[PDB]
Amino acid sequence: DPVFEILQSRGRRSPAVWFHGSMGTVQAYLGLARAIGDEVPFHAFQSRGLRGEDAPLADLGEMAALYTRRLLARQPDESRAFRLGGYSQGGLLAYEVTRQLQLAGRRVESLVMVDTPYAYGDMALKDDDDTDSLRLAIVYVNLLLMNGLGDFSHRPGIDPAELLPALVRAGIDRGLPYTPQALGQLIERHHRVARANETAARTYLPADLPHPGQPVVHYFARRHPQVYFDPARFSGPMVEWTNRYFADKDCASRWQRHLPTWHHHATPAVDHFAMLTDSASFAAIVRTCRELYLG
Length: 295
Fold this sequence. Notes:
Elements: E1 4-8, E2 16-19, H1 30-36, E3 42-45, H2 60-74, E4 82-87, H3 89-103, E5 108-114, H4 129-145, H5 160-173, H6 180-203, E6 216-221, H7 237-247, H8 251-258, E7 262-266, H9 279-293
Parallel strand pairs: 2-3, 2-4, 4-5, 5-6, 6-7
Antiparallel strand pairs: 1-3
């Protein structure tokens, strides 16, 4: 109820269950759910702490356990295999939920990961102005996208103290339906959730699945490992740190080591943030989910 959302209720096949990215929200998956369509229920988990009702979790194992408990209670027939997936951190959650479900004696028949970075455990960043400013800008755009009011289309070095009130003004101007005060609170709440999810992801160290080969795994990759952020929609120290960090990483190969029943999908998505909006990327994801979920 606070964490569990039904995005597309209809159909008699086993549900697709997807997990939030680091923003904690699931609205980004409505397009996918509609494209898969009325024969397949589409369910998703959002972060505790969005409705302001509780403290956000900052531990990947602990949030996965929450979601696992809910799935076990909603689906008491142990012979039905789960269908899991997620974009970004949501793929990480899908993995850890697969692990905990297997520990609980359940099967996962398929796992979709959309540009999920491998969990290397070595991002040791403290919060500074630069990290907060970028995170705020990303939270803002997520609220825009959440109302169809804008695209990823932030100056470098800006202090969050100047940035946060400018995001409030731009949001009102682009037509977000809130008072200044209310939007400011929503941005801060969403920012807290994002920061906790990032902590969760950065500190996680994936354990092995009991049955590594059991799920059929489809992994979709952005076009270039070293372009996590497109360097003509993004600049500044944190953007450059992120691109440098992933430039020498092969996240798909690291995931394949845990998940041997493996299907790799290259996409032309410009950067990490374009996986669901790049048309060729999105369509490949849709075509795959249709094959996986419609028998």
